[PDB]
Structure 1
């Protein structure tokens, strides 16, 4: 469980992210696709993008970035009490999109990378540690739903 102090460090930096959701969303997905090319193959709607310049130019990619970070934000603001928000997400990602838990670990790493680039002063080691905890909590609760459905993996 995160403490109240750690949740405050998470939400203090998230309020920054929310100043520019679309720029953040795009940086994170591009970092994910460049660092782990196998993730791009899951998106029929983005598979055609071959370079970083092409990714940067895609309005649809940017629009999906907003989708992802808006869902993540709604979870983070529930500070662990996120059952209603998380359940539909795990169901679709396990059963419809077929996303391995490992990929959620990849995109967690991408989020931390980008937060670190854009918000140094609000993202020192203590914030980084709290954000890693929040994302681990996210993954741990999703993995439990996967297991139930028969997708641990």
Structure 2
């Protein structure tokens, strides 16, 4: 469980994410796609994009980056009590999108990278630690839904 201390750190950097969701959402998906190319193959919708410059020029990709960060933001502000929000999310990812839990680990890593680039003084070791925990709790609750459905672990 995150402490109320750790959540404060989490929601304090998230409030600045919210200052430019689109921006952050674009950087995050691009990092994920470049670092883990197989992840791009899960999107029929963005599969055509070949270069970083193309990804950057895609307004539709920018639009999906807000969709994603918007769903994450709502979960995070629930501080742990996110079951209604998480559920539909795990359902669609396991069963429609077929996204392995491992791929959820790579986007976490992408998020924590971008946050670090964008908000140094706001994302020290301590907040990095808190965000990592929040995303592990995310991963863990989603995993328990996947196993219940007969996907991944």
TM value normalised by structure 2: 0.99
Q: How many residues are paired up?
A: 153
CA offset digits 1:21-58 (Å, max 9, x no partner):
00000000000000000000000000000000000000
CA offset digits 1:117-138 (Å, max 9, x no partner):
0000000000000000000000
Give the corresponding residue for 2:115: 115
The offset of 1:108, in angstroms, is: 0.1
Gaps of 5+ in 2: none
- Does 2:54 match 1:44? no
SS in 1 for 2:27: helix
Aligned equivalents of 1:14, 1:107: Cα separation in 2: 16
CA offset digits 1:56-99 (Å, max 9, x no partner):
00000000000000000000000000000000000000000000
Gaps of 5+ in 1: none
The offset of 1:152, in angstroms, is: 2.0
Give the corresponding residue for 1:149: 149
SS in 1 for 2:44: coil
- Aligned-residue CA RMSD in angstroms? 0.4
TM value normalised by structure 1: 0.99
SS in 2 for 1:16: helix
Aligned equivalents of 1:91, 1:44: Cα separation in 2: 19
Aligned equivalents of 1:107, 1:127: Cα separation in 2: 18
Aligned equivalents of 2:96, 2:41: Cα separation in 1: 15
Aligned equivalents of 2:63, 2:96: Cα separation in 1: 20
Aligned equivalents of 2:97, 2:128: Cα separation in 1: 29
